[PDB]
C-alpha cells in the first residue's frame, strides 16, 4: 500500500539519521565516562540534546502512518516503538505535576540519610553506612534502627507523592488504551499478529504465578534452613514456625539473601573456589583476562572481538568504573572496565563480552530492532557466560586450577547454597513486590490498606514479617530504588528463569555429563550455533520465537532452574527433616 511504502521510506531515513546521532551521543557519553571533564560533560550534553530533539520530531512524523493500515509486522514493530505517546497524552498541567513528582521521589531517595538520635550531626547514607549495617551487623536493635529509620525517613516522605504518582500514571496508561499502569508495563512482553507465538499482557501474571508455585517447595526448604541458622545467629528473636523478620536478611529490604552466606554456610571449613591467587601467580593482566574471554566465545563458534574493540576499550583504570558494554553503532563496540586481576573481574569480563557478543550478532538489524528480544534477554545472555566460566572444568582448562582438582560434595553444596541465597531468594521478593504494584495500579488495594496488604503479602508469599507495625503513613515499597525511581521490577524474575533455560539447552547441545551446575559450553560450536540463532534476531521476532530458537519451547519455564539446584534441594530436604518447612503468617516480632 502507499501508506505502508511511505512508512518504510520514513523508517529508512530515520535509521540513517538515528545511526549518526546515536553514534555521536554514544561516543560523547563514552568520552565523558572515560575522561571526566567539563568539556566532555558539555560535549555529552550537546549530543544527548540533539538526539532527544531528533527523537521528538521523529515521533511526531511516525504518527502519520497508522498501524491500522500497516500489514508488515516488522514495519509495525518499528512504527509502534516511535509512536508511543507516553506522558505526552496528559495535559501540560498533569504532565508537569507528574514530572515534578518523579524527580522529587528520585531526589528524596538518593539524598536519604538517617542520623544518630542521641547526636544528630552523626548521619549515615544508604551507601555505605546503612548497607554496611544491614550486611554485617549482628545487633538486632542496630539492624532494626537502620531498617526502621530508612523506612520512616524516606518512605514517609514518599507516601503522598506515590499516591499522586499512581493516579497520574494510571491516567497516562488509560489514555494510551491500557487498563492501568501495570498493564502498561506488562505490554513489554506482549506479542500480537504472529500465529502460534502470541502473548497477552494478562498471560504474564498467570505464568509468573504458575512458575512461582513450582518454585515454592525449593524456596520453603531454603527458607527453613536459613531460619534455623538465623535462630543461632539471633537467639530468642526468631520463631521456629514463623516468618523471618524483615531486618535480618542481609540487605535493606531482603532483596537478596547474599550476605547471609557466612551465617548459613553448610561446611565452613571448606573454602570456595577462588583462583585470584592462581591468576596473580601466573602474572595475569587485564588484557589476559579479556583474551581468555574472547577465546571462550570463539570456542563455541562466535566471532572474536573487533580490532576497534581492542583499540578503543578501556580495560585498565586511568573515569566511571562501572563495568559496561557499549554498542555505539557503525561497527564500534567497546567495554569499559577498571579490571583487577581477581576471579570476580574475570567472570565479569565474560559477562560484559557476552553483552558485546549479543550486540554484534544483531548489528545487521534495522536500528530499532538492535535490542534484546525482551527486557530479560540481555542480562540472561550475560549471566550464562559467568556460569560457564566459573565451573571447575573451565578453570582447569585455562590452567587456573590443577588437573587433578576434584570438587568434593561439601564444596558443591556450599556453592549451590550461595547461588540459591542470591538467585532463589530474590524470586519471591521480586514476584511479591511487582504483584503489589500491579494490584495497586489495578485499584485492588485501597490506599488505607496499602501497607496492611504489603505486609500481608510479605508474610504470605515471601515468608518475611515486619519487625514493627507500619500504618498507612509509611510507603515501604518506595524505600527501594526501583519503586521510587519508577522502574518495572519483574525483569529480575523473568531474566532469572530465562538464564537457566538458555544454559540447560546449551549444555544439552554440548552433550554435558553430570549435574547441570558443573556444565561448561567451551568448545561446543553446536551450543554457540543454538545461541547465535537467537542472538542474531535482536527484537525483529517475538521473544517467544527467539526463546524457542535456543531452547525449543515458546514460554518461560522454571524447570531448568529447579534442575540446576536439584542437588541443593535434595540436601536441604535431608537437612530439614527435623524442622518445620514453611511458615505461619500469624507470628510477629512485636506481637
Amino acid at each position: 500500500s502507499t501508506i505502508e511504502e511511505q512508512a518504510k521510506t520514513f523508517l529508512d531515513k530515520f535509521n540513517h539519521e538515528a545511526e549518526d546521532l546515536f553514534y555521536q551521543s554514544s561516543l560523547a557519553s563514552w568520552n565523558y565516562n572515560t575522561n571526566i571533564t567539563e568539556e566532555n560533560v558539555q560535549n555529552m550534553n550537546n549530543a544527548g540534546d540533539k538526539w532527544s530533539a531528533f527523537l521528538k520530531e521523529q515521533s511526531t512524523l511516525a504518527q502519520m502512518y497508522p498501524l491500522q493500515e500497516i500489514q508488515n509486522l516488522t514495519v509495525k514493530l518499528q512504527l509502534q516503538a516511535l509512536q508511543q505517546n507516553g506522558s505526552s497524552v496528559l495535559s501540560e498541567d498533569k504532565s508537569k505535576r507528574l514530572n515534578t513528582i518523579l524527580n522529587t521521589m528520585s531526589t528524596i531517595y538518593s539524598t536519604g540519610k538517617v542520623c544518630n538520635p542521641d547526636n544528630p550531626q552523626e548521619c549515615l547514607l544508604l551507601e555505605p553506612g546503612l548497607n554496611e549495617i544491614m550486611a554485617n551487623s549482628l545487633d538486632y536493635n542496630e539492624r532494626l534502627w537502620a531498617w526502621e529509620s530508612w523506612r520512616s525517613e524516606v518512605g514517609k516522605q514518599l507516601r503522598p507523592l506515590y499516591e499522586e504518582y499512581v493516579v497520574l500514571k494510571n491516567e497516562m496508561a488509560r489514555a494510551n488504551h491500557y487498563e492501568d499502569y501495570g498493564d502498561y508495563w506488562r505490554g513489554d512482553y506482549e506479542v500480537n499478529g504472529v500465529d502460534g507465538y502470541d502473548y497477552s499482557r494478562g498471560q504474564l501474571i498467570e505464568d509468573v504465578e504458575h512458575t512461582f508455585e513450582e518454585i515454592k517447595p525449593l524456596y520453603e526448604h531454603l527458607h527453613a534452613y536459613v531460619r534455623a541458622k538465623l535462630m543461632n545467629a539471633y537467639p530468642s528473636y526468631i520463631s521456629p514456625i514463623g516468618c523471618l523478620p524483615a531486618h535480618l536478611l542481609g540487605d535493606m529490604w531482603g532483596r537478596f539473601w547474599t550476605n547471609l552466606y557466612s551465617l548459613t554456610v553448610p561446611f565452613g571449613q571448606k573454602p570456595n573456589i577462588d583462583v585470584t591467587d592462581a591468576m596473580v601467580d601466573q602474572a595475569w593482566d587485564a588484557q589476559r583476562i579479556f583474551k581468555e574471554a574472547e577465546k571462550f566465545f570463539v570456542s563455541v563458534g562466535l566471532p572474536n572481538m573487533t580490532q576497534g574493540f581492542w583499540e578503543n576499550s578501556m580495560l585498565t583504570d586511568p573515569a566511571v568504573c562501572h563495568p559496561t558494554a557499549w554498542d555505539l553503532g557503525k561497527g564500534d563496540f567497546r567495554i569499559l572496565m577498571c579490571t583487577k586481576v581477581t576471579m570476580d573481574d574475570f567472570l565479569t569480563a565474560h559477562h560484559e563480552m557476552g553483552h558485546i557478543q549479543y550486540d554484534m550478532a544483531y548489528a545487521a538489524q534495522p536500528f530499532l530492532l538492535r535490542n534484546g528480544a525482551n527486557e530479560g534477554f540481555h542480562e540472561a545472555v550475560g549471566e550464562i557466560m559467568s556460569l560457564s566460566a566459573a565451573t571447575p572444568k573451565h578453570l582447569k582448562s585455562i590452567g587456573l586450577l590443577s588437573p587433578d582438582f576434584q570438587e568434593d560434595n561439601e564444596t558443591e553444596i556450599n556453592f549451590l547454597l550461595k547461588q540459591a541465597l542470591t538467585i532463589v531468594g530474590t524470586l519471591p521478593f521480586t514476584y511479591m513486590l511487582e504483584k503489589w504494584r500491579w494490584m495497586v495500579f489495578k485499584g485492588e488495594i485501597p490506599k488505607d490498606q496499602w501497607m496492611k496488604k504489603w505486609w500481608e503479602m510479605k508474610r504470605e508469599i515471601v515468608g518475611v514479617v515486619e519487625p514493627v507495625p507500619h500504618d498507612e503513613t509509611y510507603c515501604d515499597p518506595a524505600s527501594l530504588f526501583h519503586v521510587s525511581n519508577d522502574y518495572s521490577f519483574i525483569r529480575y524474575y523473568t531474566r532469572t528463569l530465562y538464564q537457566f533455560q538458555f544454559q540447560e539447552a546449551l549444555c544439552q547441545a554440548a552433550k554435558h555429563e553430570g549435574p547441570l551446575h558443573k556444565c561448561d559450553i567451551s568448545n561446543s560450536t553446536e551450543a554457540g550455533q543454538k545461541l547465535f540463532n537467537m542472538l542474531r534476531l535482536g527484537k525483529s521476532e517475538p521473544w517467544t520465537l527467539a526463546l524457542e530458537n535456543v531452547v525449543g519451547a515458546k514460554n518461560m519455564n522454571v524447570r531448568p532452574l529447579l534442575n540446576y539446584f536439584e542437588p541443593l534441594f535434595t540436601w536441604l530436604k535431608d537437612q530439614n527433616k527435623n524442622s518445620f518447612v514453611g511458615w505461619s503468617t500469624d507470628w510477629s516480632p512485636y506481637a
Partner: peptide
Amino acid sequence: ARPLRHRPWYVS
C-alpha cells in the same frame, strides 16, 4: 547519561 535504542532513549 547515555543513549538507548528504545524508549526512554536517554537514560542517566
